């Protein structure tokens, strides 16, 4: 009858030195949780989210958009803090020397999105379009998914995309780690503030021991040297407890896109 895995499984999607950060995060969570934690990476948000929703992961770091989409099947564990707050923006980016004044001038672009289930890499911009009565197929000459925010930036930097939609946290971090790459882009539009991508758990595992230990591992990550090392590399400050109401601005956009679709 019970169908337990051999280990605690923590899901995420892809993170420059990503192996170094992943190793440390895996070792930290193992050290904190008190037993082996395996990091399970999948390429897309809906793949990580479905694994979580089916109880095939004990927790996962997902986007607020899929979190709110599967809100009744999932519980929030903790939210990251960046620049002192559990919030971030979507940046609509163009080439550094592109002469244009605003978003409306991106009509006819080739546009790079990150993932159809990304708040900052799809939804926010999809909201801009829907508010103006258009979809990506109508407004742009082409759009595609890069399946990563670093890739959106590279797509715009290289000229394959005229414009892109990116996580503004990612853009700011890369500005410091790959400055010559990010200097080939510039921020055309910054969105409003949304809840930072949270760690969530299947709603059935609410009071489970693995979830409780994961949660403390996140909230106490600043109190251990290896935990601090992970936070430093991600340029994050820690994790805090939030409730679903922190994600209301995301749900509101989801509804605009539906209402107006």
Numbering used by the authors: 42 to 56, 59 to 304
Text of the article:
In the initial single-wavelength anomalous diffraction (SAD) electron density maps generated from the crystals of Se-Met labelled protein there was an unaccounted electron density in the putative ligand-binding region near residue Cys106. The electron density was consistent with the presence of a phosphate ion, from the crystallisation conditions, and its location would suggest that Cys106 might be involved in binding arsenite. The crystal structure of the phosphate-bound AioX was used to solve the structures of the apo and arsenite-bound forms of the protein by molecular replacement. The presence of a phosphate ion in the binding site of AioX leads to the hypothesis that the phosphate ion mimics arsenite binding. A comparison of the X-ray structures however, indicates that while AioX can bind phosphate, the resulting structure does not stabilize the 53–61 loop conformation seen in the arsenite-bound form. Furthermore, even though the structure is similar to the arsenite-bound form, with the main conformation of Tyr88 akin to that of the arsenite-AioX, electron density for residues 53–61 are ambiguous and due to the disorder, we were unable to confidently build a model for residues 55–57. As AioX and ArxX did not bind phosphate in conditions tested in ITC, we conclude that AioX and ArxX do not bind phosphate under biologically relevant conditions.
The regulatory cluster consists of three genes, aioX, aioS and aioR, which encode a periplasmic-binding protein (PBP), a sensor histidine kinase and a response regulator, respectively. Arsenite-bound AioX is thought to act as a ligand for AioS, the sensor histidine kinase that upon auto-phosphorylation, phosphorylates AioR, the response regulator, which binds to a conserved sequence upstream of a RpoN promoter. AioX exhibits a typical bilobed structure of the PBP type II class. In this class of proteins, the ligand-binding pocket is located in the space between the two domains.
